[PDB]
Design a protein around this ligand. Structure first.
Ligand code: AUC
Ligand code: AUC
Ligand code: AUC
Ligand code: AUC
Lengths: 243, 242
């Protein structure tokens, strides 16, 4: 891992405390704006839908790629979650309640087992089975997100290749003939000024025959600043020629 | 399958002869502008990249999803390195000719039988039967084949069906996902037109729509109608837009 000092230009303008980790081809060739923060561990928030989806499929909690998660007609925290959702839909709109129920059906024992298998952060799922990723003790770093996503990319997670392929298609966010982005956002809340929340954007880009793995997180105490989780990384990647 | 003749104005407006088949949920609920043309069989041309890629993977000719097809051509297109997805989505004639040759006639025939793929006639040369040979497939049959692929019901590993499906993703939004494939045999004349295709499926919210379009093409300028006619019909049906 190398430090790229020029990438802090993007951070300084908004007064953002954050890290971007960008790896070309594999996780052996990574660069970052902040070496210290690259392996600092933060709540995963909705980025945990990735492992959770794979585990749901692996355990049979989620039947297959075409399972519909039906809305019961009761109030949800976001209006965009108040509807029937596919697995991809639930991931893409970050429908928390769908994955809370998946996590419950998975259960603590199976959840612990798979996070050990995936080497997923501090592997600490205390804080409640339906909230450990958002309010609990689970922490993961940008470096670890890249390692995990690389494994997913190569189908090297301890899960079926079928199930890894399913979750991979659910993560597509940008598609062109020779350009494909898989990605996922995360946002833990605004916390306080003294103890800010965290915002994430993680994933990988396939450009022509090259692949780039990325993970961004930042402290956030103001919800207005949220779009910087995609705009900072995008600006960095565009400056490096990643279309 | 029901006929919806009100769609014909989208074809006549551009002075083209063609067919659109659109199915909500499954191939038991289809509609088309022209029942006769919906079951007529045409050269698959570049829509054959779907079955050819699946068969390539099934036989081991294509190693996996991360295989790179390296260039060792009168198209700039065919002098680039391509992923499997890249090769499916761009012009890559040498790649697919070579895949077909390595598969060979016996295995190719067997898989097209298993897939119920058109007239199943692979005469005309092992590396050209889908483009200038005897192979023909209807718009209805394309929808049935694509529905099978969607459901992982083709006679092929689920893994390989999933690989080829992600390579066909062409549009992505949180609750809108399009898997699609163009086809084109070349510009013909009025008497002897080429064929152009657009086939695939749209996932909108928790619904899926299977579609297949073809048209006779006798003018290079009319090629983009392969997407715009289907798009206009899907707009009118409420699939495109809210
Ligand atoms: N899985 C899951 Au989550 C959030 N926030
Ligand atoms: N495979 C395949 Au083709 C064209 N045109
Ligand atoms: N791409 C592609 Au072909 C042929 N024949
Ligand atoms: N089997 C088989 Au045959 C051809 N051509």
């Amino acid at each position: 891992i190398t430090e790229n000092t020029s990438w802090n230009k993007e951070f300084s303008a908004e007064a953002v405390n954050g890290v971007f980790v960008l790896c070309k081809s594999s996780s052996k060739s990574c660069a970052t704006n902040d070496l210290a923060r690259a392996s600092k561990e933060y709540l995963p928030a909705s980025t945990f839908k990735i492992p959770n989806a794979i585990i749901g499929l692996e355990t049979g909690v989620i039947k297959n790629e075409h399972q519909v998660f039906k809305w019961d007609g009761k109030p949800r925290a976001m209006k965009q979650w108040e509807r029937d959702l596919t697995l991809r839909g639930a991931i893409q709109v970050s429908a928390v309640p769908v994955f809370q129920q998946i996590a419950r059906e998975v259960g603590e024992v199976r959840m612990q087992k798979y996070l050990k298998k995936f080497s997923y952060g501090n592997q600490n799922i205390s804080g409640g089975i339906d909230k450990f990723w958002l309010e609990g003790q689970l922490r993961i770093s940008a470096v670890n997100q890249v390692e995990f996503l690389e494994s997913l990319y190569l189908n090297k997670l301890s899960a079926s290749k079928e199930n890894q392929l399913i979750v991979k298609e659910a993560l597509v966010t940008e598609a062109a003939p020779e350009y494909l982005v898989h990605s996922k956002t995360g946002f833990s809340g605004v916390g306080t000024e003294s103890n800010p929340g965290v915002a994430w954007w993680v994933g990988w880009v396939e450009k022509e025959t090259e692949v780039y793995f990325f993970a961004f997180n930042m402290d956030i105490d103001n919800e207005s600043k949220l779009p910087l989780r995609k705009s900072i990384p995008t600006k960095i990647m565009e400056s490096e020629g990643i279309i």
